[PDB]
């Protein structure tokens, strides 16, 4: 219900270190948002989507981050891939909405924008809504690394190459996930 500078924010987080905003109870209207041509996608799960809000809910969480265009499809219940496995995981029973839009004009630079990162290697998948910003060296072989990076001992985060002349599938997209909490104590 102050969805203003969630979407407006000049500044968005890497997906591995995704941001979170807590939004409790006030006046929240989905009549313009849902139909805006300014978003490339906006899809709701567990909600009556094109029947919009007659929901009520106790808290709403807004998670925001940047990924590559062809990875937006991983921000959905039951998906797999580096992003859904190692970076941002939605639960199967997810209840909420996924909003994304092309941010090539903000987030890609002529030399490449190496500020946005994602986790490439992880010992196991994340549980739903977990956020892992650890940077232990990834042991890819059977020999321990002891914090060196040589061969089979990899820094776990990789940078996107965001480069403005690439096709739209390789371009950066800003994502906002709205989770509708509810629980049993309103």
């Amino acid at each position: 219900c102050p969805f203003g500078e969630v979407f407006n924010a000049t500044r968005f987080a890497s997906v591995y270190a995704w941001n979170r905003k807590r939004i409790s109870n006030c006046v929240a209207d989905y009549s313009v948002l849902y139909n805006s041509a300014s978003f490339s996608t906006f899809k709701c799960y567990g909600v009556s989507p094109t029947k919009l809000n007659d929901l009520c809910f106790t808290n709403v969480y807004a998670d925001s981050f940047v990924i590559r265009g062809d990875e937006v499809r991983q921000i959905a219940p039951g998906q797999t891939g580096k992003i859904a496995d190692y970076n941002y995981k939605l639960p199967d029973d997810f209840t909420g909405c996924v909003i994304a839009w092309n941010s090539n004009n903000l987030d890609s630079k002529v030399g490449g924008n190496y500020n946005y990162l994602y986790r490439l290697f992880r010992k196991s998948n994340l549980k739903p809504f977990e956020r892992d910003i650890s940077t232990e060296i990834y042991q890819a072989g059977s020999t321990p690394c002891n914090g060196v990076e040589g061969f089979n001992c990899y820094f776990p985060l990789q940078s996107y190459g965001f480069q403005p002349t690439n096709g739209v599938g390789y371009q950066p997209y800003r994502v906002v996930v709205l989770s509708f909490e509810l629980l049993h104590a309103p």
Epitope: G69, P164, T165, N166, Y170, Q171
Partner: antibody, heavy 117, light 108 residues
Framework: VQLQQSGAEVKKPGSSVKVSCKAS????????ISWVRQAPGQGLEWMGG????????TYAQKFQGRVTITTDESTSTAYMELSSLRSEDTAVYYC???????????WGQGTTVTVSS | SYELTQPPSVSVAPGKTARITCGGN??????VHWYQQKPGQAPVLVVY???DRPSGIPERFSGSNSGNTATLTISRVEAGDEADYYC??????????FGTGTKVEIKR
């Protein structure tokens, strides 16, 4: 900037074909490459594409598992390999440059592949 | 989006205005492209980013995109415009999608 494709191919069912696309702009630059096909009397069908400087290719859902797209850095040449060919892979195959706004810009001249016994 | 629907053909008298529609859910959120194709030739991009013309494409080709329909408009149609026309978008879940194609014929 311009795109030269290899010549026509005739293939038997079950075999594979490897088609090439050589950019005349000298080098691949910073732009993406898609492969598109069109069967006789039918429409255009995206098969996949690659960022030549990123080295990882992506593929349409169908075709996943029997198409491989690669690029030759030094020669400024893209490749599309389709295997386990079947009659209905008879088509003209195009490479094309992807645009910044979501389309395709420069098209190769097309490569006819006929699959038959 | 995912599927793009085009009429199989439009038939237009010479000098009149041809309108080729392209339907898709919320196509207005996508960047529509239009290609002209003649027999034995590669597609030629004629309108990009909903309404922009590449250099060398005649003034008479125009595009629009709003809501659930995109449209290619060809003013003062002449025989040189006889061809198949494809609309096309990038969808985040289906990748590059082409319409089924519309054949423009000159009415007579």
């Amino acid at each position: 900037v311009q795109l030269q494709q290899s010549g026509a191919e005739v293939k038997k069912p079950g075999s594979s074909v490897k088609v090439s696309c050589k950019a005349s702009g000298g080098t691949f630059g910073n732009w993406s490459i898609s492969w598109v096909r069109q069967a006789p009397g039918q429409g255009l069908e995206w098969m996949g594409g690659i960022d030549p400087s990123r080295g990882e290719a992506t593929y349409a859902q169908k075709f996943q598992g029997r198409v491989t797209i690669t690029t030759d850095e030094s020669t400024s040449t893209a490749y599309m390999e389709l295997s386990s060919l079947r009659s209905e892979d008879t088509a003209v195959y195009y490479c094309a440059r992807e645009t910044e706004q979501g389309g395709m810009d420069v098209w190769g001249q097309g490569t006819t592949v006929t699959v038959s016994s | 989006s995912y599927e793009l629907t085009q009429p199989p053909s439009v038939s237009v008298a010479p000098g009149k205005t041809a309108r080729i529609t392209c339907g898709g859910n919320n196509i207005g959120r996508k960047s529509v492209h239009w290609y002209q194709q003649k027999p034995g030739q590669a597609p030629v991009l004629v309108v990009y980013d909903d309404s922009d013309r590449p250099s060398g494409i005649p003034e008479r080709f125009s595009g629009s995109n709003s809501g659930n329909t995109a449209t290619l408009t060809i003013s003062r149609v002449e025989a040189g415009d006889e061809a198949d026309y494809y609309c096309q978008v990038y969808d985040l879940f289906s990748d590059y999608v082409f319409g089924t194609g519309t054949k423009v014929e000159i009415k007579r």
